[PDB]
């Protein structure tokens, strides 16, 4: 359905309002949740006090 007309979408038993962008595995609509983490290649500096180090630069 890459850039298909609403006509063909309806003919194919689909609607043009479906945002799409979800997989169909074993007949179920699967959606991937965007996971977040710390940005790589950046040097952070923390001051964990519950340890032996006063300051810590992480990369």
């Amino acid at each position: 359905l890459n850039g298909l007309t609403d006509r063909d979408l309806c003919e194919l038993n689909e609607c043009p309002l479906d945002p799409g962008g979800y997989f169909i595995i074993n007949g179920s609509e699967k959606v991937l949740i965007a996971q977040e983490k710390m940005a790589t290649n950046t040097v952070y500096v923390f001051a964990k006090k519950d340890s032996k180090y006063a300051y810590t630069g992480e990369c």
Partner: protein, 65 residues
């Protein structure tokens, strides 16, 4: 029936036998209840679509794709 009998007698073709008709009529009966377990559905649909035009009707998008 009489016309067909006269035509057969004039043409010379020996009339079928009663037992022949009795054993032949069962052919249609046993063929009607024939299970479609072999691979004949493919040939049937092919021979149908050979003459049945494509656009009709709910497969327009599929045909375009």
């Amino acid at each position: 029936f009489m016309k067909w009998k006269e035509a057969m007698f004039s043409a010379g073709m020996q009339l079928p036998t009663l037992d022949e008709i009795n054993k032949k009529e069962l052919s249609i009966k046993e063929a009607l209840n024939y299970k479609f377990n072999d691979q004949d559905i493919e040939e049937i649909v092919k021979e149908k679509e050979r003459f049945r035009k494509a656009p009709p009707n709910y497969a327009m998008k599929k045909t375009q794709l």
